[PDB]
């Protein structure tokens, strides 16, 4: 039971907004980071589904999965998870602009399949993959948060074309969760915003759904090694059924990473 | 006398300053008597230090010349100096070279001893071969390799297979064909096997042994990695 | 509930020993560590404290806490959680001796500290510190172990006075802890083991657990600052009802934290 | 080699971390007569420092173990740290020669006459870090008045958001501490440099924000450290 008592959680300054309200730095037990809706009354329909975002956060256990630490009634409805210090994939990569090195980028992109290795091994479906969730604890270590969306519409550049062509009420499957990692796969070796020179977003819902678009590959960098180039293709297949799941694709970047030269030059006697 | 010496180069190690380092111990090698497995380590460092320092200031200077091509007073401005450090790295390795070839390998009396110095003569060969060029080239190019396979043959019937000296003669040995001869093939088809024996024979291996081997162990293959790509 | 099905906790190199069990680096959604007794068909009041030991761990969920992901019952009782990169901290002083910094010793006192204070919130206590369980994550965050003695006999080192003296069915208290945390500031700062001049088992159960025997702060480094010097006595002292509580200890630890000064004396450094 | 082409040399020198050919290069250059520009400026300063730093720092370790070890082991440390007083020595004294023959008395602005008189009283300085006995009152007192002068040179004529400025505060603060033993007067100079720092915010361009800023927290630094 993590029912919080009222009046244990301080805040802090806004961070951001996130699933269904606003988070923020607050101290309880160390730096922490808060959500909440900062609306008096909750809708009756809201409370049913953060309930569940509460009732499915309680059995994620993992190193790369965010830790929730507890959730609190009154005065507000809220949800308190561990602090990531530093930033979010999102900010390093499209904010900041900043550059890894081909072994760092490996190191994120095998740790964010790792750990979503854990939550389909317990049938829990993400469902909200997208680099503002892909957060760097001390610049090493990455989480996975954002369960508002979780289970057992934001921005579209993220989800598939299963879930746009208007399916049966349960759209959501594993393989739409695997098509959410190949796009930030994506993001993480070509170092660019997918679909730069498209600056709309009426036309890509359609197009997405109809099967006529897809992330051209000529912005891969020249570095990164046609082990990848052949995953990328096999995510980003429009198809469901022809997507590998996540234990296969994790199995696959840990070959990728033994047979990576670490150091550029021949190594001599340590000494 | 034998432990001022001794105590002098290790005051030396604190100070970052080797050239004084390695003054103290050329002296030692030239008492004549035989050395112990902690100062045979201070000669390692003490030459290996003074001699890297160069390395680099060749390396940082020869990728300059080659990257500022158009203008002709820049580049030949760049000779002389690479050629300052040139000979200059010439007088240390010949330092060494000349100390091994007169005082350090005919005193020697175990043969672990004796690979040890072999290396360390390849190794001196080694430096200079990556810097010299010409028809002079090859033929150290060629001592080199005699020092390394007398090395060789005798470190394979004396000394275990998870010796860390016998690891270092393997991983310098390997580079040796790879940046010098061009030879990958041959580079990683001793490079591969030597971890192989080794993890083969992990069961008889001390927990001392363990420390040092595994940092060479694994330079192997990182070397392997960078060289299989 | 969070019962793994077997085989997929699979087992690695043996690293060493635990409560009552031995710590492996197994494989199970990564890299973890998993610890068992390799003992089949185990006694009933062994699984009654294994069970308890599950009962406690669910209960934590804090950076500061080592991370439990799951339990296995077949075919061997054990509990599969988080893989810290390195070693304990009595690893970094005892095995290593590594040179610690003071802005760093400060901050991994700091977490440690924070760590204990989240689990006396929930009315959870250890009974077992040492710097054995001061695990030490990439040198950077800090995680508690050992919680298959702790509930919501110990190190002849890290125990207060009055659990030694065998008194009542709950002789550990939080200000037991907090003397277990004092006596771990002690190797912090010193950088030695404590009570080193006494090298028998039999002589320090009796100097010690009758109060005759307190360890001596001569030995601790001359630019350590004077206010935690203070702190660390004011935590070790003889009686339980005095010893300052743990949300204390972490307030004194942040505010000299904050006035805590750095390295290279001197600057005159331009960049140039 | 003309002025231009010697130039050049120090800055291989300076990319193949060559500090003594940097230095000996760098040392030909200003004893030509020619007025030095801002650029050649830094090279002499990261010429002469860094050889200095090599050989203080080699002290510094090899004083900590000579009085840590209470015979023969005594007089060898001592015999090797006289040695290194040697090289430091003439190192130092050649850069004060050379400073009071072609670079002061040809120095015509006066940003470039407090860069060297500040860049003067450092040699002292490291000689009074190690010199000991009736030579190290005398050798302190010829220190005093150079970073005296050159902090009312720029007390009137230059900016206190300048990094120079802000580094001869750090470096005028750092004297009375590790020389003097007065850390009454060096927090309270050091206060008053920073407090004017702060109190012109609005007048530093971008460019030298980066160096000002980097010495700014240098100071602040100290301060926390010498207030304990
Ligand atoms: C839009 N404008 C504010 C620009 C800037 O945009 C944003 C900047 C930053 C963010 C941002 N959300 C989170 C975040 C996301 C999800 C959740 C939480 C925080 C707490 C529990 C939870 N449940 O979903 C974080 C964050 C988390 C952990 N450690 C550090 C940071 N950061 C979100 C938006
Ligand atoms: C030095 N002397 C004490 C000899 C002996 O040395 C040892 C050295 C290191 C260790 C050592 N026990 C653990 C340990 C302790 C408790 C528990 C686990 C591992 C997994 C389940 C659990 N519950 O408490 C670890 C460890 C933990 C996490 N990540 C990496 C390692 N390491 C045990 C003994």
Redesign the pocket.
Known sequence: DWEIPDGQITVGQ??????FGT?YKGKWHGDV???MLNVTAPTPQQLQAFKN?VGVLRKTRHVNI?LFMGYSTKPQLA????????S?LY?HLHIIETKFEMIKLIDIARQTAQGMDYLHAKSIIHRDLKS??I?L?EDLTV?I????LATVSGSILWMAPEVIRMQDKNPYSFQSDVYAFGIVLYELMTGQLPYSNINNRDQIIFMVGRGYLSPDLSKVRSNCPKAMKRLMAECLKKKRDERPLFPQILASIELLARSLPKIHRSASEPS | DKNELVQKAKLAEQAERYDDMAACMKSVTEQGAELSNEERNLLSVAYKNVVGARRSSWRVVSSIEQKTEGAEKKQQMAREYREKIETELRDICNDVLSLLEKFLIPNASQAESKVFYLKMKGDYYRYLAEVAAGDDKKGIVDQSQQAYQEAFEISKKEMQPTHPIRLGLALNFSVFYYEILNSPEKACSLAKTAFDEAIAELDTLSEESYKDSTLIMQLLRDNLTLWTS
């Open positions: 806004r961070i951001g907004s996130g699933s988070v980071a808060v959500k975002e965010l949800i308190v998870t561990q602090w990531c210090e530093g979010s900010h503002n969730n957060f604890h989480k948060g954002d369960f508002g």
